[PDB]
């Protein structure tokens, strides 16, 4: 069952004693390969921080996150980079692009850093930008991009290197209904074809309902667990 | 992707019309190395000129072998001249006295240098305006003529001048004050400094006037070091008689020694501060302008052939910036040190004092000479400075969690 | 919430102390200024102290300047001491300066004698021990001898020394006979200095009687000046007929003057170099203000006028400048050399015994004020450029 | 009546020669007192640029944007600041807060710049935060704030001054359903009582149907102009 991610007792209390806030406390995740997961919840419900901790982008105060059996916390820096460039694709809540690199280079950066063949890199980056919807806006710097198309650039960046896990922090916040539906179509297709597991945090209830598994973050707890079959 | 896929990121640190912030790093390195070049070359010129005012002329600091009819000085001369630190040794007569000139008396130091050792172990013939070597031959006993005597003497070629010995001997008897018939054998049009405080007397008359035999007065030394000369001369005199001690000569130009030490320490403690300024500018440039770039790069980092790929990117960034700055600053420093601008007043019309030209304008002053070895030292230290000042912020930003991208 | 728009500047200055290291690079802007000020203060303080030491210890024992007679003898009522008018003149006295030769029981040497009036503030009366303060009475023919010269000549008190002056000679068939006289020394003048090896102190009346001068005729008027810098420019002052100006810049001891001119030139060179380094480090804050483009554009979106942004960044720069200046003064005064003498035993060849430091208050104040003025003035073009760009902060 | 904002012939083509991409072409708005107005459009169609331009924050290549009769382009800097500090309340597409100031101070900057009494400044800032939902969130800096909390702080920042015109770039892009509903409820209350008018760009269709006037901004053109009664 629990294969791709086994997150146990991960508790995140920032600050020191007698004033620590329970932003994350006793989160348990059993994410399988190809599992369609949607995280929903109100505000300050600890959704972005949960993504940062699962991605190993931060250090959890308590508990552990286990990725492919090998824990991420105990792992070496080189193997962390290997996971982040071959298995983990991260979409931030904000754009967090490189403002000095064009959008094409900003989505090819994972490949240019993973030491791939340049002709393959450019071709697959252009294919991904076409799949996301930036055919005419591939050569524009992020400073000459808008919030939605920067978000689409980030989503493409998390899909370029064919990750096994793609953590997404509000990939549809800055997008309309048409582009949101298109991007979830891409996510469903990658789930069907590549087998990539998408662990996405959204606030739109319809988009989360179009996805197989729902988890509700409230008071730093996982409440809603709905299974039909 | 070995040579091309890593300098790409560091070369893309130009941005859109925002390159005017990294240029303060190239300029920061250029100005630093230029002022370092100017300071080091100026200090070296100072040291060279001062060494021409202490040891090159009037060598001060030596063991005064005080003896009656000294004769076996050959053994000590050979044992001391070849010790490490001494360039050469040469005996001279360091007498003092009065010289007759136009029914007047002039108090002068008699420098009985050796004509046989003049060409080899002295720079007297090399400093003259240039004349035939036979003109400085011994035996005929030609002495240099001075302005203070020639003004009222009107002595020319073929004129013989009488010089009477001061007779400053322990004997109460006159003992025939040596009478020297000097002959004018040349003329100089360089300066009167060599014609007022310096004199030359043949060794025969010097020995005859001493009421003794071949009595040597002093055995002077020409050297290259002055800092270690104290203990060196002390040890050289340690092979002499123990009953005859040596009074220290440090106090004569100890204040000039402290001047040299002061200028050296001030230059060093200001130029390491220029070093600190360059490091500060580079760390400020790489801490704020590009830190979330390192954040998300570490979020999507490479395989791991070398753990510091971000460190390598910033090493290439710092190397490029520091190298271009160092080249520009070295060019500027060399061009400004080698010569000043032909016309100084033209540039500095807007001096800000609303005064014509410059009140303190100087021509062929502030001498300076370049040591390209110092240029290589400053180049290497500037490149190492930029490399460290670009690597340490990189290491600080890499090891922190990528959840420092929002802060 | 101070309603003067300096609240945001203060919050920028104290802010972003996040990981115990970000605050260091945040305060780097004033660290550069305080280090530049430290350098300038220590350079000027050491130069001033060493100049004061050289002007006192060496130059107070030898004559500073002399006024003499252009033609013939010197007539005192032409210009007496009370009528001695010159620029920067501090102390006036009569004196005779003479190049003489001394014959002792061991050998013969040369030197200079200074004939003075013992009733004045003689700088050698404290150094005259084992002897009366004015034992060189007029006609007593008593000359006080120093330490180095006496040790070199092997002569003690009570001996007769033949002092001769070459200027007053006479014709003789056996040679030249100058003015020679035997004088008895009663002790020693341990000056504990450098000049005591060739300088002699004599009365003025007996010296005047020595060179066959008429009644009341002295060699010159000695002036102890106040500054050695203006010496070159003050050689064309009001010197009427029957006088001429001489001094230690080129007549005697010219090596000291030459090395002082060279040291001054290299000192101004190093000062200019440190000043341009200080300019390069004010460019650090000039780019630091340009680094907060997002914040200035957000504030300008808040309806905050561009001149008020100029005031905000000028106040930040001025606060950095004043902090840097006061710390530079603190580390140039309290830590000039006052902490274990910089521990000179290390293999860097440091001389801890030589500490010619004199912290001039006027110089440190003017240096700190200029540093503060530059630190505020360097946020005028960056701030106007920041406020000139409309709130188009799309991460350009 | 159309008094507040009258935008005509507004165009923006500012880029390198030949590549110069146009984003707007002859856009005209008539916004009056209390006109509860919304702009809907696909990403990259020229919505955020339009508000950054009519708010005076950018320089239009051609056309006139006039606020209460006086054009912004001909106006000086001091009066522009006066308008932005008294009449215009801008919610940026992203957070665009001051990282140096806590949430309460980031909210109260307009009041502090308005030369107001601090005693009522703190009270008004606290009122706005308790209305939005961040009474307990005032002591956190933006670096310790979340995307939803940052957007709510920006919304409070644009609403404390009670501006006549409030421009909003995706005010609920990073907000859940409850917070979006509450914030649009506060928007309606401020419109009904204080008489302020909102020009809000949004992608949620239901929140746009909650709006009184709806225009569709796409490809530099205004397509939909719907009036019910
Ligand atoms: N210098 C520029 N100024 C304005 N727009 C530009 C500029 N350069 C490029 N553009 C393009 O023109 C579009 C401007 O429209 P914009 O309003 O930014 O889109 P948007 O409405 O923000 N999409 P969304 O993020 O969903 O709101 C951008 O998508 C850019 O691709
Ligand atoms: N280091 C920190 N210090 C203080 N508070 C923090 C810190 N990190 C997070 N928080 C708070 O803890 C919560 C984090 O939850 P988070 O998942 O980021 O909310 P969010 O869902 O991403 N925002 P949104 O979904 O748009 O409503 C927020 O209330 C933050 O203000
Ligand atoms: Mg937008
Ligand atoms: Mg969130």
Short mmCIF file of C-alpha atoms in Angstrom, two decimals, chain B residues 406-407, chain C residues 11-12 15-17 292 294-296 298-299, chain D residues 95-103 105-106 140-145 150 157:
data_model
loop_
_atom_site.label_atom_id
_atom_site.label_comp_id
_atom_site.label_asym_id
_atom_site.label_seq_id
_atom_site.Cartn_x
_atom_site.Cartn_y
_atom_site.Cartn_z
CA UNK B 406 10.31 33.32 0.86
CA UNK B 407 12.13 35.09 3.71
CA UNK C 11 12.96 49.47 10.57
CA UNK C 12 15.07 48.86 7.46
CA UNK C 15 15.45 44.72 10.37
CA UNK C 16 16.18 41.38 8.71
CA UNK C 17 18.18 39.99 11.65
CA UNK C 292 15.33 47.87 -2.30
CA UNK C 294 10.47 46.54 -4.49
CA UNK C 295 10.06 48.32 -1.17
CA UNK C 296 10.46 51.81 -2.62
CA UNK C 298 5.48 49.60 -2.82
CA UNK C 299 5.82 52.73 -0.68
CA UNK D 95 1.56 39.92 -2.05
CA UNK D 96 4.01 42.81 -2.69
CA UNK D 97 4.17 43.68 1.00
CA UNK D 98 7.03 45.23 2.94
CA UNK D 99 9.11 42.37 4.41
CA UNK D 100 10.49 44.59 7.19
CA UNK D 101 7.15 45.32 8.87
CA UNK D 102 4.73 43.11 10.76
CA UNK D 103 1.22 42.53 9.45
CA UNK D 105 2.29 47.86 10.32
CA UNK D 106 1.99 46.69 6.71
CA UNK D 140 3.70 37.91 12.05
CA UNK D 141 6.06 39.39 9.48
CA UNK D 142 5.33 38.71 5.78
CA UNK D 143 8.20 36.21 5.70
CA UNK D 144 6.25 34.32 8.39
CA UNK D 145 2.96 34.84 6.52
CA UNK D 150 -0.40 37.79 2.50
CA UNK D 157 -3.96 47.48 3.25
#
